[PDB]
């Protein structure tokens, strides 16, 4: 028995205040995989952690015991009780699992990462490849194929609402009647798209707070359509004080607290005097109660589901499900391709017992001589080989065709019945 299982907390089943307790950094990926394989019913393991999901891919001997051992590990790593995890856990088994990771790599599910960060991370997961056996690696490697295949055959990616994109949109959903002085803390991959999707909405000026000034200056010249000014983290609390809505994306514990915002001035009377703290950084940078302040409201990555939803984004979605369906049933075809391998080993084991017994019962009736023994042994192995070659060849099958694969497995079943390879 062996099953490919995906376990974890997604954005659709668990709140951000629950997932962030399990957000495993890239540095601890080898350690997380090591611990998971320390479990009895776990052979291989992998950790996929983005701002919209926390998912654990494992190779389990028994899936009922495999899931349990992992769910406990999730509790012993998050502090969240096992009882609460089960009420928010996401769990798919086999081809539902292999499809899911394909649907993630294709950016088909939930808000997207953007600029192929989702596909880049999976490549990075594979690059971190040490002992994550050959089955999990096989699935992830094929997920990269699907991810890039969807990228090149369907530019669905060029019109998809990304996390950073929805951050800009949701900001305008809460803000009246812009402009209206936007500010972005943290200039990264997420930070870039926040400004990029901010510029495309008619934003004249944007304040960007970041550690590296060189990092910001590189962004300003790429997109010359919006005015970008730099200020360091020292004036982070100061820049937020001179902005109507603050975008926070960094890799930090929260940066803005309750009484750190209480000391801030009110926003302009042109936008209602309210401040919008949009936090797309995971774990969060704002919170966990800043919204208690009168002139300030906090929006998590979870609230990005509220907007938006407008046309071809469902046509491209169906065009990608064609790709997913094709590779998903082609990957499972490759997993079934290897099911005959243990039978081939057992057929040699059966053939050897007969070949030995008949040869041992022959030498007892024959001593002499030197070059003859090597002639009676070659005959013994000659009959067996040409007898095995038939079934042996028809147990090894690959490529596609729902007929050759179907017929090969039936051959295995017959050899099991005929030679009693079950025992």
């Amino acid at each position: 028995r062996s099953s490919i299982v995906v376990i974890g907390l997604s954005i659709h089943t668990a709140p951000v205040e629950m997932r962030e307790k399990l957000a495993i950094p890239e540095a601890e990926w080898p350690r997380a995989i090591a611990e998971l394989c320390g479990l009895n019913h776990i052979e291989e393991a992998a950790v996929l952690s983005t701002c919209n999901r926390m998912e654990i891919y494992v190779l389990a001997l028994s899936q009922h015991r495999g899931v349990k051992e992992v769910t406990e590990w999730m509790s012993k790593t998050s502090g969240i009780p096992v009882s609460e995890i089960c009420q928010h856990r996401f769990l798919l088994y086999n081809k539902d699992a292999t499809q899911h990771i394909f649907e993630v790599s294709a950016g088909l599910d939930s808000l997207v990462l953007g600029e192929g960060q989702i596909l880049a991370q999976v490549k990075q997961v594979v690059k971190v490849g040490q002992g994550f056996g050959r089955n999990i690696s096989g699935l992830f490697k094929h997920a990269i194929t699907v991810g890039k295949r969807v990228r090149t055959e369907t530019n669905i990616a060029s019109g998809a609402v990304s996390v950073s994109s929805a951050a800009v949109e949701l900001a305008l959903m809460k803000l009246p009647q812009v402009s209206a002085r936007m500010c972005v803390i943290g200039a990264g991959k997420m930070g870039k798209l926040v400004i990029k999707h901010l510029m495309a909405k008619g934003c004249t000026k944007v304040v960007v707070v970041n550690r590296s000034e060189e990092r910001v200056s590189a962004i300003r010249e790429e997109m010359p359509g919006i005015e970008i000014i730099y200020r360091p983290l020292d004036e982070m609390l100061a820049c937020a004080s001179e902005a109507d809505v603050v975008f926070t994306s960094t890799a930090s514990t929260p940066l803005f607290l309750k009484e750190h915002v209480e000391n801030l001035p009110q926003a302009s009377p042109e936008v209602g005097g309210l401040r919008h703290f949009v936090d797309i950084s995971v774990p969060r940078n704002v919170g966990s109660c800043v919204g208690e302040v009168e002139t300030a409201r906090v929006y998590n990555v979870d609230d990005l589901k509220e907007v938006v939803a407008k046309e071809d984004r469902m046509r491209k979605a169906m065009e990608a499900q064609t790709i997913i369906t094709e590779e998903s049933t082609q990957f499972e075809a490759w997993r079934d391709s290897l099911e005959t391998v243990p039978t081939i080993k057992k057929l040699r084991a059966y053939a050897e017992r007969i070949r030995v017994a008949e040869l041992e019962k022959c030498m007892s009736k024959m001593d002499i001589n030197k070059k003859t023994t090597r002639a009676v042994d070659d005959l013994s192995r000659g009959i067996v080989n040409r007898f095995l070659h038939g079934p042996m060849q028809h147990l090894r099958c690959d490529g596609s065709d729902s007929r050759t694969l179907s017929e090969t497995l039936e051959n295995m079943h017959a050899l099991n019945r005929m030679y009693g390879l079950e025992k």
Binding site: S337, V341, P342, I344, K345, R386, H389, M392, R396
Partner: protein, 117 residues
């Protein structure tokens, strides 16, 4: 000393017949020590194939591959086609016990191409 080779050689197969791989492993070691000393390529592959087989029963599959890979080397060094096919099967047998069905599959595919001739 030449009689000591065949003596312990067939002696090792007896222990493998009665599932005692530890006492079997020791005998094939000595048999190899004699086979190399007498400088006979044919007798060398015998003890080597015996060693790998005795290791498979102890669960030492990864170690066993090394000795099953020796008989592949002895044949190439002697330009001999003897004992090669059984090696490719034996190696593939080990990978199958490791849970690795793709390498075993490739090594089994090669095993089929030799059963013809």
């Amino acid at each position: 000393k030449k009689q000591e080779l065949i003596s312990k050689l067939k002696t090792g197969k007896t222990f493998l017949r009665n599932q005692e791989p530890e006492k079997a492993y020791t005998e094939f070691k000595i048999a190899l020590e004699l086979a190399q000393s007498l400088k006979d390529p044919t007798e060398e592959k015998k003890a080597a194939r015996g060693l790998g087989a005795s290791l498979q029963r102890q669960g030492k599959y990864r170690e066993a591959i090394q000795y099953h890979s020796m008989v592949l080397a002895i044949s190439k060094r002697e330009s001999e086609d003897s004992g090669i096919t059984e090696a490719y099967g034996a190696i593939a047998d080990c990978y199958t016990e490791l849970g690795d069905l793709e390498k075993a599959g490739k090594f089994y595919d090669t095993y089929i191409a030799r059963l013809e001739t």
